[PDB]
Homo-oligomer: A and B are copies of this chain.
């Protein structure tokens, strides 16, 4: 069968609407089958000295479904190789957000600056269900 047919085991898989605010970047994609995240691109060149942080545009906006959350995670390779991290990791993308996804990168290396180029894959976006809990206040209840 061709790929337009949804296989039985994927009947209930979730769709995510996405706008490329920067049409010159590829759509985010999973690096390998079954990978949890789609990789987000940087729309911009950024140089981070040790300890500096920047709010980096990804060129995309998404519509996370109600009842779900988008989560922006660092990539392990950049984290290990150069100390690149995300200040607010895991970044929380709410269902109602329609703005551009931005990544708060930070250089956690003590001495070597990190150069990010436009078109580099700088984070990964996961989508999960979340419990939109109803709080029940009690006076008292490992």
A92 near B80 (CB under 8 angstroms)? no
Q: Tell me the complex Cα distance, A136–B126, Å.
A: 15
Q: Tell me the complex Cα distance, A22–B7, Å.
A: 39
Which of B87, B124, B134, B142 is in CB contact (< 8 Å) with A92? B124
A73 near B98 (CB under 8 angstroms)? no
Which of B37, B67, B85 is in CB contact (< 8 Å) with A87? B85
Which of B63, B74, B92, B135 is in CB contact (< 8 Å) with A16? B135
Is A95 part of the binding interface, using a Cβ–Cβ cutoff of 8 Å? yes
Nearest CB in chain B: distance from A47 CB, A:
15
Is A75 part of the binding interface, using a Cβ–Cβ cutoff of 8 Å? yes
Q: Tell me the complex Cα distance, A28–B79, Å.
A: 24
In the bound complex, residues from chain B placing their C-beta under 8 Å from that of A35 are 94-96, 142
